[PDB]
Design a protein around this nucleic acid. Structure first.
Ligand code: CL
Ligand code: MG
Length: 439
DNA sequence: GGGGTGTGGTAGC
DNA sequence: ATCGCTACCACACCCC
């Protein structure tokens, strides 16, 4: 048991946090792409005609946690029992659940308490622990297999278990559904073999957005090939509005109010107008949705194809701790800020950069929100506050950065006992070069 | 035309 | 118990 005023807190929290792991894994995969390809040219140009294979493990954490489960769970059956991955027994997030669990209505992001009530009498929920190092090892096998197949011109990491793979089609070659289907089956079988039993689904298309939609249709343990020429009202009828990439809960609600609760993407595409959509959700996101309903990518999405090395370059660095934050006084808050700055400066030094702009963000208990939230050590319902500072000279000096961070906290006027979360950010990074002569 | 800030949404499981 | 991260885009609203 490690409290937020213990020196070991950041280490322990990050060791247990699957969301920390997801972000750290992704950052590491981006860095590896850059190192792997530093003398390989890997971009897409205006002259290229290409096909997208969007590949994702099926219920990744639950699959791997099951395959590596301890002997206590030896008689667990992945095809017959409902399985979740989580830390706890009550208000603990279900990070991943298998398709048996989903068949009873259990969904990721539910709390264990919630999901247990959906099970009929006699049927027990199997809760597996996280197996973080095994998640990483299976990801290594995944990316190694994709490269070894030598069928892709560009392999872009999306996440620990998800990649966008691009195949350039020369105009002298006649691409067919049969070639694409056999490629999907080769990929699926090789990954199944290479990971000792994990399955992937694949969406295959001539746009990023359609390959993402095709992938959703392919799950679980399957593939789907839907090109722009194959588009149909039946396709668009298959999807909810937040199945579109970049449409979450908040955008979904805006679309339902504006366009009288469209049920499917086919509903939305027959009702919307471009200006009404831009007014509803914003100009750029409205244009993105407009283009996606034609199966087309927007300019922003295509950037990763045209210059992946620039897109995958890290441009900021931060930590967020919004669980376990219970401080009694400002001395302990300040020590925690100092530990956070030390951690961030270690990362900043690892990548040989300085920073010229920093931000402190905090979560403060809402006035009407309960003092102890329903979730043990949760932030509960909170108000967001942030303040940023431009440093004079770009720096990696602890004295400068930690002092300014503590001063930023001071200016936001959050009493320590109302603090429920903190984020420390280096917003602008500057390269360290061989010439550090400056008057 | 250029610049700036704080706030909020989204994605991976 | 329980581990609600984090990079990036985009917006509203301020200034020359
Ligand atoms: Cl999952
Ligand atoms: Mg979505």
């Amino acid at each position: 048991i490690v409290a937020c005023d213990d020196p070991d807190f950041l280490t322990s929290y990050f060791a247990h946090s699957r969301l920390h792991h997801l972000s750290a894994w992704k950052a590491n995969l981006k860095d590896k792409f850059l190192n792997e390809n530093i003398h390989k040219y890997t971009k897409i140009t205006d002259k290229d005609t290409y096909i997208i294979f969007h590949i994702d493990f099926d219920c990744f954490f639950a699959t791997v946690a099951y395959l590596c489960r301890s002997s206590s769970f030896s008689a667990c059956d992945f095809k017959r029992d409902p399985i979740v991955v989580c830390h706890g027994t009550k208000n603990s997030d279900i990070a991943s659940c298998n398709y048996v669990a989903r068949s009873y209505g259990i969904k990721n992001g539910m709390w264990v308490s919630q999901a247990e009530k959906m099970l009929p009498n006699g049927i027990k929920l199997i809760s597996l622990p996280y197996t973080f190092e095994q998640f990483q090892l299976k990801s290594e096998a995944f990316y190694s297999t994709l490269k070894r197949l030598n069928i892709f011109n560009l392999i872009l990491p999306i996440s620990i278990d998800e990649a966008v793979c691009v195949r350039i089609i020369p105009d002298n070659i006649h691409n067919t559904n049969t070639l694409n289907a056999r490629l999907c089956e080769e990929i699926r079988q090789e990954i199944f073999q290479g990971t000792n039993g994990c399955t992937v689904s694949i969406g295959c298309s001539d746009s990023l957005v359609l390959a993402r939609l095709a992938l959703k249709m392919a799950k679980p343990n399957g593939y789907n090939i839907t090109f722009k020429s194959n588009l149909s009202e039946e396709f668009w009828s298959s999807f909810k509005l937040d199945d579109l990439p970049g449409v979450g809960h908040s955008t979904l609600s805006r679309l339902e109010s504006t366009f009288d609760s469209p049920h499917s993407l086919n509903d939305l595409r027959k009702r919307y107008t471009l200006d009404a959509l831009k007014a509803s959700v914003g100009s750029k996101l409205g244009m993105k949705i407009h283009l996606a309903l034609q199966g087309q990518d927007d300019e922003e999405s295509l950037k990763i194809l045209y210059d992946p090395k620039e897109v995958l370059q890290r441009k900021s660095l931060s930590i967020d701790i919004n669980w376990g934050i219970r401080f009694k006084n400002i001395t302990q808050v300040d020590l925690f800020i100092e530990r956070g700055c030390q951690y961030l400066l270690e990362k900043l030094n690892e990548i040989n950069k300085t920073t010229s702009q920093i931000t402190l963000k905090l979560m403060r208990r809402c006035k009407d929100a309960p003092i102890e939230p329903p979730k043990y050590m949760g932030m509960g319902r909170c108000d967001s506050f942030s303040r940023s500072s431009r440093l004079g000279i770009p720096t990696n000096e602890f004295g400068i950065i930690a002092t300014e961070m503590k001063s930023l906290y001071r200016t936001l006027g959050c009493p320590p006992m109302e603090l429920r979360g903190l984020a420390l950010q280096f917003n602008k990074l500057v390269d360290v070069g061989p010439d550090n002569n400056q008057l």
